Design a protein around this ligand. Structure first.
Ligand SMILES: *CC(=O)Nc1ccc(NC(=O)C*)cc1
Ligand SMILES: [N]
Lengths: 17, 140
């Protein structure tokens, strides 16, 4: 789950950019 | 354009599914995740950054969405680096305010939260909160 939060944060930044 | 995905993802929000779990399952299914949904879940990530920063250092108070957003953007979404920069930045401001006679006991932690971490806006708010006790004690 901590890996899932890290993936989500990185994925949301890629989407924002 | 198969808009079935976002309505189903909006179902998951209604049922109360975690955004990370929705995302991780879509990635395991080889399904293209709609970028519009990921972008729209930025406030969730920033609230995630802020409370993780609160867990990392209780006693620096609550972290604002503005402070989490700056750390998170500057660290390019790296969650662990964003939390650490969030904490380090706030501790610097709490010390800056401390150097002006406004420590956590005087309410600096809450003034930094209420004003998104701007030291200038927090200092003006703290000055007012020193002035009003005098106004009501000097008159009564
Ligand atoms: C686990 C993890 O960090 N995953 C991940 C998936 C995709 C992306 N990039 C985009 O979504 C563009 C980053 C990280
Ligand atoms: N992006």
């Amino acid at each position: 789950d901590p890996a899932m939060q890290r993936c989500f944060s990185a994925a949301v930044y890629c989407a924002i950019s | 354009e198969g808009l079935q995905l976002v309505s189903m993802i909006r179902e998951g929000e209604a049922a109360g599914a975690c955004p990370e779990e929705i995302f991780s399952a879509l990635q395991y299914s080889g399904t293209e995740v709609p970028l519009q949904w990921l972008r729209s879940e930025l406030p969730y990530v920033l609230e995630m950054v802020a409370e993780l920063a609160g867990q990392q250092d209780p006693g620096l108070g609550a972290f604002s969405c503005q402070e989490a957003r700056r750390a998170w953007l500057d660290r390019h979404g790296n969650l662990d680096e964003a939390v650490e920069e969030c904490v380090r930045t706030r501790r610097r401001k709490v010390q800056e305010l401390q150097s002006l006679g406004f420590g956590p006991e005087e309410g600096s932690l809450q003034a930094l939260f209420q004003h998104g971490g701007d030291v200038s806006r927090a200092l003006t708010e703290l000055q007012r909160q020193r002035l009003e006790p005098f106004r009501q004690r000097l008159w009564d």
